[PDB]
């Protein structure tokens, strides 16, 4: 579990959205494995603009924050699961690293800030849907 929290939004792992985050929707997308919903407090994350490909992420199934280089956001295909049949994801960067399910919505970040979410793993590499492109979480 984990969650992003910029502004007035708060942002998971679809698969593990609440009945409140589907009730105060902003955006979903079921092929990223995102949601945003409103949030009533203000944030203090920053979500990072740039082109990085080297940062940290918090890996909960080993209590350990590991650096990583990582892919540019890319279609992937991946396996079916308990919450997805198999199709292509979009808009992931995988890594070589350790991740379970439980570890989904673990944060990577770089020098600038927020990078991403863990939502995928298996086979020795992490997976993580990028959120550097969702220009309007940083305004109104
Ligand atoms: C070894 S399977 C694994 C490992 C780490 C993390 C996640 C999984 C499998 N998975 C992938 C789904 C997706 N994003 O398509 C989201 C939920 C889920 O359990
Ligand atoms: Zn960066």
Request: with cysteine.
């Given at each position: 579990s984990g969650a992003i929290y910029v502004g007035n939004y708060r942002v998971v792992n679809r698969h593990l959205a609440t009945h409140n985050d589907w009730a105060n929707l902003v955006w979903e997308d079921s092929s990223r494995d995102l949601l945003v919903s409103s949030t009533t407090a203000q944030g203090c994350d920053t979500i990072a603009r740039c082109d990085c490909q080297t940062g940290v992420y918090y890996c909960s199934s080993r209590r350990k924050h590991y650096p990583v280089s990582f892919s540019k956001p890319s279609l992937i295909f991946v396996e079916a699961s308990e919450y997805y049949p198999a199709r292509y994801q979009s808009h992931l960067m995988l890594a070589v690293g350790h991740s379970e399910?439980?570890?989904?919505?673990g944060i990577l970040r770089c020098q600038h800030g927020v990078v991403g979410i863990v939502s995928t793993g298996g086979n020795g590499l992490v997976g993580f849907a990028d959120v550097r492109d969702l220009l309007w979480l940083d305004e109104e």
């Open positions: 399910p439980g570890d989904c919505g």
